[PDB]
Amino acid sequence: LSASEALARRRSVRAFTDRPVDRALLARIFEIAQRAPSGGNLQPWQATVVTGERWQAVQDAVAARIVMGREGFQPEYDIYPRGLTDPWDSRRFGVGEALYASLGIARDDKAGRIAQFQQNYRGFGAPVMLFLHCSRIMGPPQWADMGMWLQSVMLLLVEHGLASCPQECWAMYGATVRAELGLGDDQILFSGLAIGHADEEAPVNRWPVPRVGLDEVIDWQGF
Amino acid sequence: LSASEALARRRSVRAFTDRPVDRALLARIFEIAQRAPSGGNLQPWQATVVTGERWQAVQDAVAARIVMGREGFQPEYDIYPRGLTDPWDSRRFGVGEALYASLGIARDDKAGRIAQFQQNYRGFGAPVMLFLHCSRIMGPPQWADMGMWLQSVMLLLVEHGLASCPQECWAMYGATVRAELGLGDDQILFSGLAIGHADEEAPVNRWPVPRVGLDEVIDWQGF
Numbered sequence: 097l098s099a100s101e102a103l104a105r106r107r108s109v110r111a112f113t114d115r116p117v118d119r120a121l122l123a124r125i126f127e128i129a130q131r132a133p134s135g136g137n138l139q140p141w142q143a144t145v146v147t148g149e150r151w152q153a154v155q156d157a158v159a160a161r162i163v164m165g166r167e168g169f170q171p172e173y174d175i176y177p178r179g180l181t182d183p184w185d186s187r188r189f190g191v192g193e194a195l196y197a198s199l200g201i202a203r204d205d206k207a208g209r210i211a212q213f214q215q216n217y218r219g220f221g222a223p224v225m226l227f228l229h230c231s232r233i234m235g236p237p238q239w240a241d242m243g244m245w246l247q248s249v250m251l252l253l254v255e256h257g258l259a260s261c262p263q264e265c266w267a268m269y270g271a272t273v274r275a276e277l278g279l280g281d282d283q284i285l286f287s288g289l290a291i292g293h294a295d296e297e298a299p300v301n302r303w304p305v306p307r308v309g310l311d312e313v314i315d316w317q318g319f
Numbered sequence: 320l321s322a323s324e325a326l327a328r329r330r331s332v333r334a335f336t337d338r339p340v341d342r343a344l345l346a347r348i349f350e351i352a353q354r355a356p357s358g359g360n361l362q363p364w365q366a367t368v369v370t371g372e373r374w375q376a377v378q379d380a381v382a383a384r385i386v387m388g389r390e391g392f393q394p395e396y397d398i399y400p401r402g403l404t405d406p407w408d409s410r411r412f413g414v415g416e417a418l419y420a421s422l423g424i425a426r427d428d429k430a431g432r433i434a435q436f437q438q439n440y441r442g443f444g445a446p447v448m449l450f451l452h453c454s455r456i457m458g459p460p461q462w463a464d465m466g467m468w469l470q471s472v473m474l475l476l477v478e479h480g481l482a483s484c485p486q487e488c489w490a491m492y493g494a495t496v497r498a499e500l501g502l503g504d505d506q507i508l509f510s511g512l513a514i515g516h517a518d519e520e521a522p523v524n525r526w527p528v529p530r531v532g533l534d535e536v537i538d539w540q541g542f
């Protein structure tokens with residue numbers, strides 16, 4: 097599988113089969129993903145990978161927070177910018193529209209879409225959850241470094257016939273997640289990464305995901 | 320070239336040939352790179368790509384700042400964390416020594432380190448410079464998004480027989496660069512990316528670049 101093909105085939109998978117992930121395979125993928133570049137070769141990314149009973153504990157701990165409602169939230173940071181405007185805000189809901197449409201839940205049906213949302217905290221049934229975190233001394237460019245590493249992993253997973261869904265929803269309960277994992281407060285949780293084998297027949301995995309055109313992204317000067 | 324191979328063969332290239340870059344190739348690469356994921360599909364990354372006369376104008380404007388010395392600096396942000404410590408600093412010093420050894424530039428050699436500094440602001444002789452920037456409303460997770468896009472770009476270049484060097488050195492003169500590109504102060508410059516055909520005979524492009532072992536990266540729980 098070529099780099100181009102891996103990139104095309106990578107999507108956020110929100111339906112996984114009940115099927116284990118070979119840990120030896122995982123380690124080899126992390127080995128190669130470490131070749132991601134970073135400012136000053138700092139390699140600021142740290143990861144805690146969980147499965148089985150530990151993965152079950154994290155889910156339980158967060159579930160206990162979820163039923164507290166808005167009172168239970170523990171945001172690591174502002175997931176979205178507070179002053180978010182168009183064109184960006186609309187991009188969120190365009191993808192949202194497609195996702196829920198691909199399922200069998202109406203637009204107005206606020207009850208059912210909530211239910212599917214909570215599936216996030218089961219990692220959409222993935223056997224493995226990766227938690228990506230770093231020291232709180234790190235600034236924005238090191239967060240960009242983390243992104244380079246995370247995309248490397250996601251691409252490598254696809255090349256090896258695995259799949260993933262990156263999840264910032266975990267940062268909504270950062271302290272609970274950090275406490276459950278045994279991470280100290282010197283660390284900040286950025287994102288989770290659900291990892292497993294895709295259910296390739298699941299409709300939620302088959303809808304075409306949109307992107308803006310290059311005219312909204314790239315300016316050419318001097319050509 | 321497989322995704323694994325692309326990741327392994329990508330390095331920060333600091334010597335380029337005069338061979339021109341097919342814009343048609345670049346544009347197709349960007350089309351694919353847009354498939355990078357982002358939190359909420361915000362796709363926050365923006366890029367202004369420059370070549371030819373406009374590219375030299377940017378160099379000229381920044382060069383005007385360099386001769387001002389420490390007064391010429393216009394930091395967009397802290398490139399390295401204030402209060403950086405080990406293990407990360409040690410990682411930096413490792414690649415630094417390696418890079419300078421390949422150039423034949425000594426510790427005492429203040430002349431060469433300055434020249435090497437100045438070479439950064441020529442994009443190391445690359446025919447095309449990409450400037451990655453975003454709205455100033457974006458937060459750290461959106462900077463991670465930019466990182467996912469940028470690594471996507473760097474891998475695709477390598478797949479197509481091209482090469483790159485990510486460059487935060489441009490952020491040192493952000494306002495000069497943004498002013499020259501015609502960017503407003505609503506935008507913040509993250510990084511440059513030099514793009515072109517690598518000079519593979521160049522020793523600076525040939526030394527083995529270090530990475531820490533997975534024992535410093537991944538914690539396994541529940542296996």
Ligand SMILES: Cc1cc2nc3c(=O)[nH]c(=O)nc-3n(C[C@H](O)[C@H](O)[C@H](O)COP(=O)(O)O)c2cc1C
Pocket residue numbers: 106107108109110191216261262263264265266287305354355356357358359360460463464
């Ligand atoms: C950092 C990050 C966090 C994400 N978090 C979530 C999440 O918590 N829940 C979710 O359903 N999708 C999440 N996503 C997936 C995005 O919604 C998705 O990347 C975007 O819609 C593009 O679609 P695609 O990745 O399937 O191509 C996340 C993506 C990124 C990059």
Ligand SMILES: Cc1cc2nc3c(=O)[nH]c(=O)nc-3n(C[C@H](O)[C@H](O)[C@H](O)COP(=O)(O)O)c2cc1C
Pocket residue numbers: 131132133134135136137237240241329330331332333414439484485486487488489510528
């Ligand atoms: C965001 C970013 C900015 C960078 N800026 C520079 C730079 O200004 N000058 C430079 O020589 N290298 C720069 N680099 C290259 C790093 O030093 C390099 O990625 C790291 O040493 C690992 O080496 P490699 O990319 O060749 O594998 C940058 C890398 C990243 C990710």
